[PDB]
Amino acid sequence: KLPKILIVEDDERLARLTQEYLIRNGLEVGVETDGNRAIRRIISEQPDLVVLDVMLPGADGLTVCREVRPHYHQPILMLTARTEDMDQVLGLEMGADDYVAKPVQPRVLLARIRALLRRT
Amino acid sequence: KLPKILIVEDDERLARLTQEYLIRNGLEVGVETDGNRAIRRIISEQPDLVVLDVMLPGADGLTVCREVRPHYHQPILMLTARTEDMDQVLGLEMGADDYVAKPVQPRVLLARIRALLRRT
Numbered sequence: 001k002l003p004k005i006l007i008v009e010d011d012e013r014l015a016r017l018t019q020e021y022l023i024r025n026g027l028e029v030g031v032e033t034d035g036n037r038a039i040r041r042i043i044s045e046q047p048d049l050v051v052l053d054v055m056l057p058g059a060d061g062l063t064v065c066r067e068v069r070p071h072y073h074q075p076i077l078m079l080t081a082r083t084e085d086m087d088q089v090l091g092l093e094m095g096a097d098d099y100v101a102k103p104v105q106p107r108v109l110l111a112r113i114r115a116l117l118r119r120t
Numbered sequence: 121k122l123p124k125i126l127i128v129e130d131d132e133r134l135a136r137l138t139q140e141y142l143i144r145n146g147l148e149v150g151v152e153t154d155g156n157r158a159i160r161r162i163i164s165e166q167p168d169l170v171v172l173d174v175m176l177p178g179a180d181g182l183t184v185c186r187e188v189r190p191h192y193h194q195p196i197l198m199l200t201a202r203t204e205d206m207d208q209v210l211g212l213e214m215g216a217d218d219y220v221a222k223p224v225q226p227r228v229l230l231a232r233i234r235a236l237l238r239r240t
């Protein structure tokens with residue numbers, strides 16, 4: 001009954017800090033650091049929501065979004081370390097549900113995760 | 121067994137003039153004016169190439185690309201009646217194969233359709 005979140009992020013330090021905060025707030029959270037494994041993992045485990053970094057070893061965020069959408073219908077929240085309008089429009093038009101600039105306050109990330117889960 | 125083209129254009133007038141020209145030039149051509157109907161028709165009829173307007177009643181051209189690309193792998197030539205900033209990059213990155221601003225001379229459109237069909 002706890003929402004399952006998958007954090008796809010290559011920055012291990014930030015990913016674990018975020019995972020611990022979300023677990024303390026009633027979420028079941030896993031971490032993936034590779035785009036290729038993230039594609040198979042998202043399709044196989046079917047998490048309730050994905051937090052997806054744009055730049056990853058292997059498949060980048062846009063590729064992950066494109067490859068899972070036909071087999072994964074749950075929300076995708078993208079995170080970026082640099083605010084560029086082009087990448088934000090492409091991420092949303094590719095099928096992402098949100099696109100947030102890093103760094104994001106942990107409580108804001110949780111509020112955005114809860115908002116996305118309300119329409120599933 | 122001519123190449124099958126689907127023109128997805130809500131401007132019925134231009135669509136029929138283009139259809140007439142392409143049929144006279146050795147192509148089998150159908151016309152669709154609604155984006156939601158274009159998604160179902162592209163996936164079920166599997167045309168050899170789609171000429172896709174970016175602005176349609178129902179699903180927009182970017183939505184048509186996003187929804188057909190998992191099930192349709194033939195060329196998509198996108199058309200726009202008004203160039204907007206970032207429009208070409210988004211369509212090409214979404215899976216379109218070309219992006220042309222109207223008005224396009226009919227002979228130029230035929231040359232572009234033939235060039236795309238050579239990539240198959």
Ligand SMILES: [Ca+2]
Pocket residue numbers: 009010011053054055056
């Ligand atoms: Ca990264």
Ligand SMILES: [Ca+2]
Pocket residue numbers: 055056057058059060
């Ligand atoms: Ca990469």
Ligand SMILES: [Ca+2]
Pocket residue numbers: 129130131173174175176201
């Ligand atoms: Ca139009």
Ligand SMILES: [Ca+2]
Pocket residue numbers: 155175176177178179180
């Ligand atoms: Ca529309």
Ligand SMILES: [Cl-]
Pocket residue numbers: 029030031032
């Ligand atoms: Cl994990």
